Amino acid sequence: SPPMNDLNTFVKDAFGRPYIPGSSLKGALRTAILNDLKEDTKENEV
RNA sequence: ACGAGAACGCAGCACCAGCUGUCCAACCUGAAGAAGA
């Protein structure tokens, strides 16, 4: 109850519809599956 | 009054005929809108 100060926009393709782009899931799976090491962030085949 | 005088090395004739500037090759590689607004 503090009034709409500002509004955020989910990324949506040209047909209105929302979607989660590529490389966003890649960052998410980097923070997920990169639990092993902290060196392979550019050249890793995963 | 010259081993002399006179006498076009000249006439005709396509540097031309055939021939892919072609063949192979990804504008490609690596990269979160979070965060105490």
Side-chain angles (χ1 to χ4, degrees), chain A residues 2-46:
Chain A
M4 172 73 75
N5 197 0
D6 198 309
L7 190 148
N8 297 115
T9 316
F10 202 97
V11 66
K12 307 179 181 48
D13 49 7
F15 288 131
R17 178 200 66 78
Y19 78 112
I20 299 193
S23 66
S24 297
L25 299 182
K26 184 176 276 198
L29 71 92
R30 182 181 319 243
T31 198
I33 322 171
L34 264 289
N35 192 1
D36 59 358
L37 280 77
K38 318 144 190 195
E39 49 87 20
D40 47 351
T41 177
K42 181 176 178 179
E43 294 294 328
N44 194 348
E45 72 270 11
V46 73

